[PDB]
Amino acid sequence: VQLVQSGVTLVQPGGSLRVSCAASGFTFSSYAMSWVRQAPGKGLEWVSAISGLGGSTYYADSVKGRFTISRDNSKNTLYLQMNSLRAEDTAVYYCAKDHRVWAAGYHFDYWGQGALVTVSSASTKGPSVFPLAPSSTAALGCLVKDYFPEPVTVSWNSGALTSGVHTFPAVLQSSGLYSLSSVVTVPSSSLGTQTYICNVNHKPSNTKVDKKVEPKS
Amino acid sequence: DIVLTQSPSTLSASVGDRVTITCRASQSISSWLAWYQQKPGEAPKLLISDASSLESGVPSRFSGSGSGTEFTLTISSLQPDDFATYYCQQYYSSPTFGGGTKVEIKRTVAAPSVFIFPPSDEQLKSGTASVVCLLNNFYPREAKVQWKVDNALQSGNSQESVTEQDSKDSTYSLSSTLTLSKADYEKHKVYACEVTHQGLSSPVTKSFNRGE
Amino acid sequence: IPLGVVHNNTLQVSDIDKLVCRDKLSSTSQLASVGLNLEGNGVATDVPTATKRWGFRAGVPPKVVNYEAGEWAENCYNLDIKKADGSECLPEAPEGVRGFPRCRYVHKVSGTGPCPEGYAFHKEGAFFLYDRLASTIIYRSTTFSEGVVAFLILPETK
Amino acid sequence: IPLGVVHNNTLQVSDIDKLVCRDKLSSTSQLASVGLNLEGNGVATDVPTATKRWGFRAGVPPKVVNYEAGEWAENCYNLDIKKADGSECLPEAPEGVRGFPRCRYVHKVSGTGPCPEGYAFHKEGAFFLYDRLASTIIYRSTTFSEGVVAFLILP
Amino acid sequence: IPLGVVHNNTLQVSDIDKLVCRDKLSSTSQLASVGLNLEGNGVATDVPTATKRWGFRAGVPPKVVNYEAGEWAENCYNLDIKKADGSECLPEAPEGVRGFPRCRYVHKVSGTGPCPEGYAFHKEGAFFLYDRLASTIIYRSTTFSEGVVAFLILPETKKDFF
Amino acid sequence: AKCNPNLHYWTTQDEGAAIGLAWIPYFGPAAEGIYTEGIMHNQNGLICGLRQLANETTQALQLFLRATTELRTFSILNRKAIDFLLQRWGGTCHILGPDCCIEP
Amino acid sequence: AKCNPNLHYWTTQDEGAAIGLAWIPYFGPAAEGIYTEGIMHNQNGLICGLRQLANETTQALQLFLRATTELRTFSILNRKAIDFLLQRWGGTCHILGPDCCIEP
Ligand SMILES: *[C@@H]1O[C@H](CO)[C@@H](O)[C@H](O)[C@H]1NC(C)=O
């Protein structure tokens, strides 16, 4: 009784993408499946639904134009063919199964892990690493700017300093270019005798830059 | 169409406390309603169906009630696994989700640490200037940060982010970024960040002079 | 409205946007509307649960749909029900409507109860089967079965 | 249900299985439903013979079918029939139903009769003509004619 | 009977003899019957004028046509009309017929009238709107608006309607 | 100049809310609350020309109601659908012909 | 899900049983005796499937009954045939096209 969505996906504006939700461990054709999308920092939204049999398909007002849902009971597989994608449609897509009702209602007990779909349509570029110097307990940091796409992994001295470390969530800019910030707090005395180097590992852009932090005047 | 609403968006609670969330629909959807649970980064999990019948494998402490327009989710005893976002769904009309009620454990009041950083020199070489104002180790979560440049408020040019509660210390952290052009940065000399929080009797402000 | 198809003895569903030319419609006789009783779905066929599934509603007009084929019911229900003042909860059967033809057991329940509404509907939404005429509402003194209707295409000649 | 065709002005047969590509259907107006009176078939047109063919029957629901076209009848029949208790043998005529438009003679029969059954049906199976509505049962106080119905296509 | 077609931001009338390949019909849902109230097309909106437009006639059977779509009426009329003997002028409403769904104002006329006829008809020929049923004859105690019915083709590619 | 450019319409629902739980008549809405509202405006030609079509249609429609003996005729629109198919495919369909809808 | 694999159905064949001798109303059978019996069995997909499909159809059918004002709707079956023909034939049929069914 487990569902498996698509691992990772990336697209462009008005682009076409297929999300495949595999189903196993319990009878498929008996029940009716549906898609539900979650935008970052937003509540869930109902996308599309298909009857357990497949005769009836249902779409939402916003998505009815540009989306298409389809199923094969033999392969026990659910396909969401997404056309004419927009920036608003960028989300994590979950595929679920019915809670109590049998092909009658749209209850959901068991959810898939989700499939990430991103329609940002920005050229993939290496992050710019800018260090933040300490004043005068003291705080210091590193700033990642104009990077795309997610993710970015941040480590201190290749992970040597695990404690007292804060990595903030990524933020969307108007330019459509993400920016992230990571900081650490250490005693005032230890700053001079120790060197702090931040490691940014960005796989898509293959950008691995290590930037040392010094408090100079 | 029909949209439901939630009363507590963020509810401050502690372990083993009786918790009640109230979800009232615009129209009367009778007995057809459901409640869900989503932990950070985890798939949504089914709490209750028809507002009366409980799903299998679900802890017995949770209960739900109400009919017609009114509905209430009640937890007699709260547990470490109960801190996640909660929504309400009605099948009478358009499948619709509530704003959600996030559960937190910030009973303790902490004073925010304020650190203000000027834009780095390489960034100045890029032609872009970003000033960063840092708030660290503060619960409660609510806070308000204003940017003041030469005793002048700046609106729309600020971007803000909040980390999740840390398991060890239970403290949230917030960052505010003010982004401006090289020219706009160099024209104004003094940059200041004003922090308004509960922990502090007087709202504290940290500032720097350009090129100092 | 959903439409099921039978090709070589296994029903597959043909969605509306999709178009199969290979599927052949020779005549109207191929097309059919069939009612199916709830007995087959393993629901409780005893009176106490059945009186619980049905409920009364007003402001809602009755609607009627015809079905050519129907299923033998082990259990059939005929209703005579009045109030304390003696007034009738259900309407007299309209013309052209008759009781279910094949019933093994006809349960007759006569007692007084509160009429909260003008007409009787199935809470679960199941149609009340009658003679080739399905109604969402119950009629007085008429044997009926609890059931739902489907429309299918039969490949009788190829 | 049978469909006769007139192409060349000679009835050729359209079998259900057969498919003639040459035939053209431009519109629904081409299709028509036509009643024909029994008077044409040379049966006796007198009341005593007419009352014998009808007989009363129950357990059989009435059925109604529409016909656009009809024929002038020399003889038409209106029935008022009650029982010895004065009760009415036949039910009253439904809404939207009117008497036969063209009748040269209207025979009226008012008498007491058995009337054991619920409705009155025709033994030979001929339909009772009314205004563009054919019925298998007789209706009280309504002029009607005895006839049968066909469906034809017009080129 | 006339049948309208819709172009891209353009209206044309489809005649029966002429044949058009371009007009594409995918399904019956495209086809629709709409009702437009005569009130909107600038007639004077008031009761005294309303009593002049309606008139009674017998020997003519009633005819009923269904209309799927209808228009919000600013003014609606409900009738209780009896004779000098107290007998009822209009017939009871048949089953399945309901009052007009959308009426901002309902004018109620309860009065004595001549009533020398079996049924009530509209003189100019505008139909009497009801609940998804257009009728040529008035019904006692049923709220109605004065209107007409048309039949149109709706295109699927961009939903101007439904 | 008497035409009302604006069109405020009440109508039925075909696929508007295909959510799967208001169809049950018991918990369903009353006959009065089922209808939907919509508005078409800022179009002089589309709106004014249509009241005109229904107005003229009333004529051809009346003779039909008189012709049919049916008390209630719901098949007019559908008959029109029949006629549509019959005008084209009713008669032998010739490739590249004026009547036949066939293009190579 | 409990499914009854045995399907015992009563129905009235159109041409199925053109036996005759019962058309005459005087001698025709009673309403109870007109029906014919039939049995479909030894099939696990079809019988179970038929029960399910009616079950899913109830939704769209209910919305349809509420939408139509006719007290009794016998025109449901005929509309599907119209849609079937309109989906292929209604559009201009292009030879060797996806919607068109013409093959050389
Ligand atoms: C309709 O399309 C044609 C062809 O592109 C164009 O000439 C015309 O301006 C369009 N009309 C409208 C109202 O969009």
Numbering used by the authors:
A (entry chain M): 2 to 137, 144 to 224
B (entry chain N): 1 to 212
C (entry chain C): 33 to 190
D (entry chain E): 33 to 187
E (entry chain A): 33 to 194
F (entry chain B), G (entry chain D): 509 to 612
The study reports:
All five ebolaviruses express a single glycoprotein on their surface, termed GP. In producer cells, the GP precursor is cleaved by furin to yield two subunits: GP1, which mediates receptor binding, and GP2, which mediates fusion. GP1 and GP2 are linked by a disulfide bond, and the GP1-GP2 pair assembles into a trimer of GP1-GP2 heterodimers on the viral surface. To date, only one naturally occurring human antibody has been described that is able to neutralize all of them. This antibody, termed ADI-15878, was identified in a human survivor of the 2013–2016 outbreak.
No structure is yet available for Bundibugyo virus GP or any human pan-ebolavirus antibody. The fold of Bundibugyo virus glycoprotein, not previously visualized, is similar to the fold of Ebola virus GP, and ADI-15878 binds to each virus’s GP with a similar strategy and angle of attack. The structure of the ADI-15878–EBOV GPCL complex was determined to 4.25-Å resolution, while the ADI-15878–BDBV GPCL complex was determined to 4.75-Å resolution. The EBOV GPCL complex was refined to an Rwork/Rfree of 28%/32.3%, and the BDBV GPCL complex was refined to an Rwork/Rfree of 30.6%/31.1%. BDBV and EBOV GPs share 64.7% sequence identity overall; however, they are 88% identical in the GPCL core. Thus, it is not surprising that the two trimeric structures align with a Cα root mean square deviation (RMSD) of 0.59 Å over 786 residues. Primary sequence differences between EBOV and BDBV GPCL concentrate in the N-terminal tail of GP2 which is not visible in these structures; however, upon comparison of surface electrostatics, an electronegative trough is observed beneath the fusion loop of BDBV GP that is largely absent in EBOV GP. (A and B) The electrostatic surface of EBOV GP (A) has a more basic cavity beneath the fusion loop compared to BDBV GP (B) due to the amino acid differences N61S, Q188E, and A189T in EBOV versus BDBV. CDR H3 residue W99, however, makes a direct contact to GP, packing between the base of the completely conserved GP glycan at N563 and conserved Q560 in HR1A of GP2 in both EBOV and BDBV structures. In the ADI-15878–GP complexes (with EBOV GP and with BDBV GP), the fusion loop adopts a conformation that differs from that observed in all Ebola virus GP structures determined thus far, whether free or in complex with antibody.
